[PDB]
Design a protein around this ligand. Structure first.
Ligand SMILES: [K+]
Ligand SMILES: [K+]
Ligand SMILES: [K+]
Ligand SMILES: [K+]
Ligand SMILES: [K+]
Ligand SMILES: [K+]
Ligand SMILES: [Mg+2]
Ligand SMILES: [Mg+2]
Ligand SMILES: [Mg+2]
Ligand SMILES: [Mg+2]
Ligand SMILES: [Mg+2]
Ligand SMILES: [Mg+2]
Ligand SMILES: [Mg+2]
Ligand SMILES: [Mg+2]
Ligand SMILES: [Mg+2]
Ligand SMILES: [Mg+2]
Lengths: 259, 122, 39, 98, 113, 126, 79
RNA sequence: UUACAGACUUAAGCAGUGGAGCAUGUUAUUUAAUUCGAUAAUCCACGACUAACCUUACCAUAUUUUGAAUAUUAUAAUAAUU
RNA sequence: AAACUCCAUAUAUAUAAUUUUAAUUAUAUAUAAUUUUAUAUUAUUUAUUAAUAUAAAGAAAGGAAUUAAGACAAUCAUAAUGAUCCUUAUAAUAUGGGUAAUAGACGUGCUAUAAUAAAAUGAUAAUAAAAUUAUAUAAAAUAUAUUUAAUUAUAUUUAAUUAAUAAUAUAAAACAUUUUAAUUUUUAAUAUAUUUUUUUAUUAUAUAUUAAUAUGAAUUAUAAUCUGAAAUUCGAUUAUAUGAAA
């Protein structure tokens, strides 16, 4: 149920940053080494400068290297605080900020896209999917990098009484028990809606000999009546609410508990 | 063994305290416990410090004829001196002020009767 | 000062020398009292 | 075992001929093993990875429009200037000509 | 301008130190001369050839530089450079293996039961 | 196992529409690799962390199919492969005993070159 | 012990000059096998620090130069 | 300063081991080097996932000098741009 | 923290055209226990109770990981940051040597000091598990040591397999038979037997000896082999000889 549904558990393949299996072990070692090196290279491409006093630091998570039989997809989460033009105007619709220029060389640039260069390094098709996170406390890796690299002036002379206060009012204190029990009630309701659907579809009769071998209950519509994409998916999704967080201060040691 | 070992352990336990200090022996068992566990490192401390005197003053310029040794032990200073200055050394005066239990003096006779610098003159 | 938590860097002037162990010293330091660790 | 050795040797020789195998009835050391061992050079020479990786120094010409900053390099250069100001700089290196 | 090794070689892409550079140089030159060394070894060990040719091959083999010797290649940690306790399944030392393993960097490695 | 089983199920669906009788996925024995990492104490305390890697295996067999259709199956499932899954394919082609038109090593070449060089010819002279 | 069928451990050495001039042969090839030709010639064999002078006799053929140039000093205790 | 309980440990019981040769680590000593590994008095400085070369960190001799990096400024050889 | 969770175990379903065969299996999913009930006895806070035993049901009996603080240790040759010092040298390369030296001492192992225990032999081949093999695992056969053969070691050759397929690899102890110094407790020559692989009788079968043998395998001589470009300092194996301590 929890591990038999894609929306209720994290696939164990996601526990590893390099998702690969090659019969040729040497090629697997090489691909693993190539993923660490490219990850380091990408970390060096996140710091950009427009002018001497305009340095935009994009905070990037570690890369997720999905190695399939035909291609390699490099997925990473990034956070960027747009401080140069944070207005209510539409001036950003007439120029490409530095972060858009950086993201457009990953795949869009027709002559020197990073994917084609990497496609020769790996000898396979390569795609890069940057995914933008709007808050810095949605990814443990991004959160640690921000503090470590950007909040130094706040904890270099002790943790400021305001800095700590901000790190304690990030999220409203949700009641985990009530949220946990609401989730369990929704699952019971969905489970009891399907059992009722089948019980009714059986009691209504939707070869007596064949009525002892086959298990086909009837039309798919009736079995899944009132179970649609508009009500089932979002209610069963796990790890949807931040309910705990411990930061430590050099070496930043952030831990987030998403339930 | 076990009996003497315990008395030796007690003194060792006392001196373990930070910035602790030595003290005179109290009983006869402590005299033996000191001559077995504390005399050795005291003999070496006096041996490496009198050889420093003999070299930094001059091997010829170091021949004291009146010696006084004071410590919580069986004339350890005299025992060290008799070794550093050879078996033919016979200074005029050698007074050892053993500041502890009276048994230590009897043990000192035993130790110093095994050095040829200290034998009755005929 | 040394015994305090901040005197653990203080350096005092001591000298170390190596001396053999006689038989009586070896014999004495045998057992659960003198030869066994205490921590 | 009762099969005459001459007969079993004729079968071995003919069999070796059909299967393109080396027939050495005497047993003299021929070195054929050396000629058949696989070459391990390519695997050994790739131990440390592919040397033709994109490097930060190549980014200033691949993407002239974008100005990248190397924080590790930048940190080092600031530490060099700091030591020069404290008088703890590096001695001028002797020239071989001298 | 003054490369430390007789022949020009490309640098490894990752962590670099003097020992890694020396080992990497030996690895590249072993590959360039592997066939040559096998051919001389064959001539020197083929009893069908005259002793003079066999001894000539052995002399040529003894005159090759040390960087062409297969037995001088040493597996080192590709992340730290250490040469002890190096696992060949990952080319990492036991300490770097544990750190990478716990970070999820090794493709299928999990903590044992 | 999760992607392995899901992808295996997809292959069976692809084959059915292609007209390929398929059997499986048959689970093969899982391989376990193990590594022990002694920690800093090595004092016989909790001084040896253990690690392991499990290779999950599945076998899908194809029967009574023409080579062209079999190649279409492999091409399609290759195009839509999942992350972290490897695939080995053994093809079996029944043929006739006698066919039409059918179905030098580097070291040896260098040896001949070396034995012709003057440093070797100067001795082979008889 | 090198297999006899492989032959001697032959190393490049300047033997012609030592046979036409009588000069000593200074060498670090301690593994070299003393061939029967060497008999009578004078060798200076490295021991790690110095070059030990040694003349080869007929009872030294087959051995190796390193065997006659000891590399360590005899042990002694401060009794 | 009182009392209580529980510890960890203790000894008890059982089954192995305690000297010999060799293997291996340490110490001391030696050595051109025997790479490195310990000093506030009980005891106690231990790296077996492989030291012939390599490893290597030590010794002797010889040899190299912007060296493996990044940048600056020149010079060229080369390809594009213009 | 515990619960929970996973592993193990029992069971169910699914998968395998049961020649990749181990279906007595493989691995996905699910279930099960932190067991349950009656009865008698002894205690109790005596009740809707614990400790006990008795009976009944059950395959059910074992593990794993897990909080934050506080006080303290390690150079991590297992990663850093600064300061500090070297910059023709405290950086770099090559050849050789050393890390393997040897008075004493200590730790940890190995093999032994013989009969509730060592050595041989056991082919329609007694009986495992877990691993490994593209920087390979190497079958059978033949040749030599070497003898009918086997065994062991190496060479020649390189079958199959890059693997639930072939190979490393016929597990070993066990068990049976034979043998075994000390041991005159033996062996041999005659005779003898209703113990016959054996009994008995008479003769010889050494003395030495608190002791080291047909126990033990250190040390050492000689010859050959394996890896490697190279085995001298300083590697591994085999044969003949040597046979220390205990
Ligand atoms: K050697
Ligand atoms: K079967
Ligand atoms: K060495
Ligand atoms: K025995
Ligand atoms: K077996
Ligand atoms: K040797
Ligand atoms: Mg090696
Ligand atoms: Mg060395
Ligand atoms: Mg060297
Ligand atoms: Mg050592
Ligand atoms: Mg069998
Ligand atoms: Mg065979
Ligand atoms: Mg058998
Ligand atoms: Mg047996
Ligand atoms: Mg004896
Ligand atoms: Mg024997």
């Amino acid at each position: 149920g929890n591990i038999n549904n894609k929306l209720q558990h994290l696939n164990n393949m996601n526990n590893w940053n390099t998702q690969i299996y090659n019969y040729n072990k040497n090629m697997e070692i090489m691909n693993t080494m190539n993923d660490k090196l490219i990850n380091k290279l990408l970390y060096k491409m996140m710091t950009l400068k427009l002018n001497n006093m305009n340095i935009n630091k994009i905070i990037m998570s570690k890369t997720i290297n999905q190695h399939s039989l035909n291609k390699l997809n490099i997925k990473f989460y990034y956070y960027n605080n747009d401080i140069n033009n944070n207005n209510n105007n539409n001036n950003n619709n007439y120029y490409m900020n530095m972060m858009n220029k950086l993201m457009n060389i990953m795949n869009n640039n027709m002559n020197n896209n990073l994917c084609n260069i990497l496609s020769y390094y790996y000898k396979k098709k390569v795609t890069i999917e940057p995914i933008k996170l709007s808050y810095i406390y949605l990814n443990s890796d991004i959160f640690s990098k921000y503090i470590s690299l950007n909040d130094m002036d706040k904890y270099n002379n002790g943790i400021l009484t305001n800095y700590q206060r901000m790190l304690n009012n990030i999220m409203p204190k949700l009641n985990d028990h009530n949220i946990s029990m609401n989730y369990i009630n929704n699952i019971n309701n969905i489970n009891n809606n399907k059992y009722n659907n089948m019980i009714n579809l059986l009691n209504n009769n939707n070869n007596n000999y064949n009525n002892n071998n086959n298990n086909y209950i009837g039309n798919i519509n009736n079995i899944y009546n009132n179970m649609t994409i508009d009500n089932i998916p979002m209610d069963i999704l796990m790890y949807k609410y931040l309910v705990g967080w411990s930061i430590k201060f050099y070496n930043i040691k952030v831990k987030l508990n998403f339930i | 063994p076990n009996n003497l070992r315990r008395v030796a352990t007690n003194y060792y336990k006392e001196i373990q305290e930070p910035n602790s200090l030595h003290r005179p022996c109290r009983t006869k068992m402590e005299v033996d416990a000191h001559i077995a566990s504390i005399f050795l490192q005291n003999y070496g401390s006096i041996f490496q410090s009198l050889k420093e005197l003999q070299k930094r003053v001059g091997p010829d310029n170091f021949k004291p004829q009146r010696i006084l040794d004071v410590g919580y032990g069986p004339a350890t200073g005299i025992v060290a001196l008799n070794d550093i200055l050879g078996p033919n050394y016979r200074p005029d005066l050698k007074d050892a002020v053993i500041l502890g239990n009276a048994e230590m003096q009897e043990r000192a006779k035993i130790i110093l009767s095994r050095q040829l610098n200290e034998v009755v003159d005929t | 000062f040394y015994t305090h938590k901040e005197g653990k860097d203080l350096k005092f002037c001591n000298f170390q020398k190596s001396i053999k162990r006689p038989k009586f010293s070896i014999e004495l330091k045998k057992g659960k009292l003198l030869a066994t660790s205490w921590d | 075992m009762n099969v005459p050795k001459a007969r079993l040797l004729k079968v071995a020789e003919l069999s070796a001929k059909i299967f393109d195998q080396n027939f050495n009835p005497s047993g003299i050391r021929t070195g054929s093993k050396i000629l058949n061992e696989r070459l391990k050079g390519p695997s050994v020479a790739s131990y440390y990875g592919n040397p033709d990786i994109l490097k930060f120094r190549h980014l200033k010409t691949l993407y002239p429009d974008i100005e990248f900053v190397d924080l590790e390099e930048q940190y080092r250069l600031s530490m060099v200037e700091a030591k020069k100001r404290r008088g703890k700089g590096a001695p001028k290196k002797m020239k071989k000509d001298a | 301008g003054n490369f430390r090794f007789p022949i020009k070689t490309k640098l490894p892409p990752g962590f670099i130190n003097a020992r890694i550079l020396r080992d990497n140089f030996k690895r590249q030159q072993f590959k360039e001369n592997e066939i040559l060394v096998k051919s001389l070894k064959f001539i020197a060990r083929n009893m069908n050839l005259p002793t003079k040719l066999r001894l000539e091959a052995q002399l040529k083999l003894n005159a090759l530089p040390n960087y062409m010797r297969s037995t001088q290649i040493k597996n080192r940690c590709v992340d730290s450079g250490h040469a002890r306790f190096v696992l060949s399944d990952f080319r990492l030392c036991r300490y770097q293996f544990r750190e990478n393993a716990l970070k999820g960097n090794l493709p299928g490695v999990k903590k044992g039961i | 196992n999760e992607n392995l089983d899901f992808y295996s199920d997809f292959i069976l669906r692809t084959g059915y529409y292609l007209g390929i009788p398929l059997t499986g996925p048959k689970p093969l024995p899982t391989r376990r690799e193990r590594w022990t990492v002694i920690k800093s104490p090595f004092v016989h305390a909790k001084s040896k962390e253990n690690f392991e890697r499990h290779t999950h295996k599945r076998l899908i067999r194809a029967w009574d199919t023409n080579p062209e259709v079999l190649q279409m199956l492999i091409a399609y499932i290759t195009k839509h492969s999942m992350a972290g899954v490897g695939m080995k394919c053994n093809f079996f082609q029944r043929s006739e005993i006698s066919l039409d038109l059918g179905s030098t090593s580097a070291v040896g070449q260098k040896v001949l070159e070396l034995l012709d060089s003057p440093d070797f010819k100067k001795h082979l002279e008889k | 012990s090198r297999s006899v069928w492989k032959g001697p451990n032959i190393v490049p050495l300047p033997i012609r000059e030592a046979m036409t001039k009588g000069t000593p042969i200074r060498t670090n090839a301690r593994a070299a096998t003393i061939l029967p030709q060497f008999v009578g010639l004078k060798f200076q064999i490295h021991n790690g620090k110095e070059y030990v002078p040694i003349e080869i006799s007929e009872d030294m053929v087959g051995h190796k130069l390193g065997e006659f140039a000891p590399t360590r000093k005899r042990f002694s205790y401060t009794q």
